[PDB]
Amino acid sequence: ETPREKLKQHSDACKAESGVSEESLNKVRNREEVDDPKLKEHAFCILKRAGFIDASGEFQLDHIKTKFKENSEHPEKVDDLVAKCAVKKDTPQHSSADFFKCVHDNRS
Question: What is the DSSP code (8-state) at residue 36?
Fold first, then answer.
């Protein structure tokens, strides 16, 4: 009668292709360079569940800005970072990674 992580939960099929296994994501912490597919792929799986972008490819900064605002201790650059980092690309899963990347290595 123990709750198994498998079966339930989401991203069940996101682990198939997006099998980054938190490998490439780790390298993101370091300001060097990263270009992994599973990274951008997996991220898109979270963007949808997060309630940011819709399955029909549609950015929603009105919700992103709010989320990035609360719990941050530095509300002021998010607004610009959102619109600036929310570059509408040819695909949603693409721009998705940009949202979970641009607002991290904003030093250089």
Answer: -
Method: NMR
CA distance 51 to 27: 26
Rounded to whole angstroms, the Cα distance separating 102 from 86 reads 9
Type of residue numbered 35? D
Q: What is the CATH number of the domain that holds 22?
A: 1.10.238.20
> Half-sphere exposure of residue 20, counting CA atoms within 13 Å on the CB side?
23
Overall number of domains in the chain? 1
| Angle between helix 37-50 and 92-102 (nearest 10) | 90
Q: Which amino acid is at 52?
A: F
- Token duo for residue 103: 């607002």
